[model samples]
Target: TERRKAETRMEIARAAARLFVGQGLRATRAEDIARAAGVAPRTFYRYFATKEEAVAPLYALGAERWVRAVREAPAELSPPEALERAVRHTLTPGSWEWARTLIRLAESSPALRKVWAEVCHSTERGLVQALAARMSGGDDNVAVRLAASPRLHFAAAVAGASVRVAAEHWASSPLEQALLNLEVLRGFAW
Candidate 1:
């Protein structure tokens, strides 16, 4: 039931995301999402209260998947390595174009910008939950929680930035700029 709910939500999000990027967020009506997803308009409402909620379905999904990956990773792997792999797996190549389009749309629209900020905050909360599970320490205390927070937060920040940069670079250069950025980003430590 939970997985099905997630899948349906992701489906609606994918549909609306494409239209939002192509037509502009405000221009995309719920009916367009219903048509794009081949579901009834009411069904779209059942999944998401508003069109804006559907914009970052993957980010939420990515958060869930990231947690799952980290929880299941080999114990021998360093936390950074595990988190990096989880982040990479969550950000596959399939959604790159839509991601770029979403960023472009958000930059141009005030309403979308508000939704984007909310989605980002929600995503960070999700990331913290995921990182909390992976953190290794003798006990949960203020110190331990505070200690683990920065690294995970930094990883989330870097990963988010990487995806945004990658998507934009991919849209323009597709190959060369992407490879260069990837190489440069890999060397980035801190």
Candidate 2:
């Protein structure tokens, strides 16, 4: 059931990304995406608030993969090394192509950037939570408290921003730049 739901979500996101690219986000409509995804307009609304929201899943999909990798990283790995491994996991050719297209779309459209920002904010919150859990050895209360700490929050934000900057600089080599950026961050004392 969960897999089916994820498939449907991806269907919607793929359709939305295509339409957003072909017609521009401002010109695309939710009904258009729904029709392309073989769902009813109401079904689309059930999944997203607006056309922008529907497309936001493209960003979330990649972020989810990265977070999952980080969560399952080796116990002996340092936080920065684990994060580097997770970031590397997100850099497949297909994923890079999708990111390039979506990043271009977001760059060209202010409205889309606003939507992307919402997803980025959501991803940041999740990253902080996951980082806190790792830092606190899966202790729920300690994790929650660590999530509130500026140190953990900064770490999450720096990783996220590094990825963003790397993608912006060279969509094709984001993983390399992301690793370099993480290493640069590690150069500073924790």
Candidate 1 lDDT tens digits, 61-169: 5445656775576766655566556555655543556556676676676766676666555655555555555554435564357445676576655555554455445
By summed lDDT, the worst window of 10 consecutive residues in model 1 runs over: 172-181
**Best prediction by lDDT:** 2
- Across 40-140, the per-residue lDDT of candidate 2 in tens digits comes to 99888878887877777678877788888888888778778788888888874544566687877777777777876777667787888777777787689
**CA lDDT, every prediction?**
0.62, 0.78
Cα-based TM-score, every candidate? 0.61, 0.84
Runs of candidate 2 with Cα error greater than 4 angstroms are 1-7, 92-95, 171-173, 188-190
Model 1 earns a TM-score of: 0.61
